[PDB]
Amino acid sequence: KIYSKHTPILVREPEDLPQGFSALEPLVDLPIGINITRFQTLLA
Amino acid sequence: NFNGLKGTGVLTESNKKFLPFQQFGRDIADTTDAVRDPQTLEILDITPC
Amino acid sequence: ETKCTLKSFTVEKGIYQTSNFRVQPTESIVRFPNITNLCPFDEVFNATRFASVYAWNRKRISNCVADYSVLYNLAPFFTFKCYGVSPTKLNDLCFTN
Amino acid sequence: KVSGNYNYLYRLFRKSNLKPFERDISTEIYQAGNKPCNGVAGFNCYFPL
Amino acid sequence: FSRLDKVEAEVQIDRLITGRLQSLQTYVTQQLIRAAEIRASANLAATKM
Amino acid sequence: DCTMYICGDSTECSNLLLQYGSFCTQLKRALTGIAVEQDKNTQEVFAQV
């Protein structure tokens, strides 16, 4: 289960987190079976 | 007998918008009342006779 | 009907309640996907070699039609007893995976 | 096998109990004595497979 | 019904018949109590009139 | 209702319910007793001329 909430066109300085309601939605489900305890986030 | 949901009622059309990860509809009584046909993917509504 | 319900042979003047009212269904409708891919049970069961206990393998079975009738047709299948579903009722249900 | 099939193995000791559907195969040497045992199996430390 | 064999599904279905059946009695008993205080208050209203 | 609340849309369920005796026959008698009395309270208070 992958819960992504990507807000574009948000006109604000970075500072800290803004005020609002976030409803995480499972975009895609992928049933492997293995469990993960460590990982690294890739960046371009 | 929608995918194993045995029951009786009149099958009509519905306007509620399921999410892509939503397939079953429930209510306060926790009895199914909204299912989607696997073959053609319209959203239906179930009400007893 | 009201004589039978009141368990008496005559009924006095008044209003009495009796059996309920219902409408029977007209016909039946059954809907299931259209895949017909014939899941590979014989590949799993009739495999030449089986893994070890400490390194048991996990196999994925999906997007295919399940048919346990031929699977149970094999004579030496003895230790068969299921918890969630009655064993004879595996040809009329569906599973996520 | 008449000649002896020994490709199937099990274990006789593990450090701790496991949660259901656990997933790892660590074949490290297991010891029973207080002193650490490293390398080859010796006293109070034996091959776990 | 369609998931369990009929030989022992009676045991499962019995513990659910009694669960719902006991719920109704508690509701009915509440109605008898509530109907008692209303009737005890209608006689007072009739006496006032 | 006796059955549609307990074994709604399950014909075989009602067959098992008959083995519990005459339970809801009391409920229909008890619930009716409240309903008829509610009309008598209104008659007593208002209908006096």
Side-chain angles (χ1 to χ4, degrees):
Chain A
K1 304 290 197 295
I2 312 301
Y3 301 93
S4 167
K5 213 68 184 184
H6 189 113
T7 58
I9 56 179
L10 293 174
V11 179
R12 197 190 152 273
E13 77 281 334
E15 213 76 20
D16 265 331
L17 292 152
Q19 257 188 322
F21 293 100
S22 68
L24 277 177
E25 290 187 347
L27 181 66
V28 61
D29 198 11
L30 195 151
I32 288 302
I34 191 167
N35 297 325
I36 311 159
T37 183
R38 273 157 288 185
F39 64 93
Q40 186 269 331
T41 292
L42 302 173
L43 73 163
Chain B
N1 195 357
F2 278 97
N3 206 342
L5 260 66
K6 279 80 163 200
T8 318
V10 298
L11 304 170
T12 57
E13 49 87 21
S14 53
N15 70 333
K16 35 185 59 178
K17 313 269 152 282
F18 288 168
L19 270 294
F21 64 110
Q22 294 175 325
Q23 169 60 30
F24 278 28
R26 296 251 284 284
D27 48 3
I28 306 168
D30 291 331
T31 295
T32 175
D33 57 347
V35 291
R36 173 210 287 134
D37 179 35
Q39 301 183 346
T40 176
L41 289 94
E42 75 275 5
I43 312 297
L44 302 176
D45 191 359
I46 284 185
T47 181
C49 51
Chain C
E1 187 73 85
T2 181
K3 263 186 206 182
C4 189
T5 299
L6 291 182
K7 310 283 279 194
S8 165
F9 212 62
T10 51
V11 299
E12 308 303 324
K13 188 195 71 167
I15 171 175
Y16 305 96
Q17 190 169 1
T18 50
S19 85
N20 292 317
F21 167 47
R22 219 170 297 279
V23 184
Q24 307 303 129
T26 56
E27 48 176 358
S28 60
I29 166 204
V30 43
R31 287 304 267 256
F32 280 101
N34 199 15
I35 56 173
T36 76
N37 294 330
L38 196 60
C39 300
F41 313 130
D42 188 51
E43 198 275 333
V44 171
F45 282 88
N46 265 334
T48 68
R49 274 279 288 160
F50 279 30
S52 306
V53 170
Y54 67 101
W56 52 270
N57 53 304
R58 185 92 77 96
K59 191 170 174 294
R60 157 80 50 220
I61 295 92
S62 282
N63 191 257
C64 51
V65 159
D67 192 1
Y68 301 83
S69 47
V70 285
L71 180 59
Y72 195 72
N73 203 7
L74 211 62
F77 285 168
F78 300 143
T79 307
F80 191 48
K81 179 264 290 181
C82 311
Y83 299 143
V85 185
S86 178
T88 63
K89 293 179 180 290
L90 274 297
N91 296 315
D92 63 358
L93 278 169
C94 294
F95 319 91
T96 180
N97 61 343
Chain D
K1 262 160 55 177
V2 182
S3 65
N5 207 11
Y6 267 60
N7 43 13
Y8 290 142
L9 295 93
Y10 51 71
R11 285 186 186 262
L12 74 164
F13 194 22
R14 213 200 187 272
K15 274 322 171 172
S16 77
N17 172 10
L18 55 85
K19 64 192 71 43
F21 278 40
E22 61 86 20
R23 175 60 58 196
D24 50 350
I25 195 67
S26 73
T27 56
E28 305 289 332
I29 51 183
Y30 288 174
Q31 74 181 65
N34 296 333
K35 62 93 176 179
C37 189
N38 197 356
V40 295
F43 193 73
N44 289 8
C45 59
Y46 293 98
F47 184 75
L49 274 300
Chain E
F1 285 116
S2 70
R3 281 189 41 174
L4 275 297
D5 43 359
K6 280 79 67 179
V7 56
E8 62 88 21
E10 326 287 352
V11 170
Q12 289 295 295
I13 202 68
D14 178 82
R15 86 165 65 177
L16 190 150
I17 286 297
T18 61
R20 292 185 186 172
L21 195 142
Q22 199 209 353
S23 166
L24 269 166
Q25 293 179 356
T26 313
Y27 167 58
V28 164
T29 293
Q30 284 308 121
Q31 293 299 299
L32 276 297
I33 301 290
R34 267 164 191 159
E37 71 205 299
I38 294 296
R39 185 204 41 244
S41 179
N43 283 344
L44 171 62
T47 305
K48 289 267 193 67
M49 191 145 278
Chain F
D1 200 26
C2 289
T3 307
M4 184 177 177
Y5 168 64
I6 292 185
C7 291
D9 291 331
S10 172
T11 311
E12 44 196 358
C13 197
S14 62
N15 302 126
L16 280 74
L17 183 63
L18 309 185
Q19 305 313 95
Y20 276 83
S22 75
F23 268 129
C24 69
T25 312
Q26 301 193 329
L27 304 191
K28 293 179 179 179
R29 174 130 43 73
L31 277 184
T32 288
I34 304 168
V36 57
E37 183 209 280
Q38 302 304 291
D39 284 333
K40 192 173 67 179
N41 292 332
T42 302
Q43 295 291 124
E44 281 188 351
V45 179
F46 287 110
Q48 287 181 355
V49 286

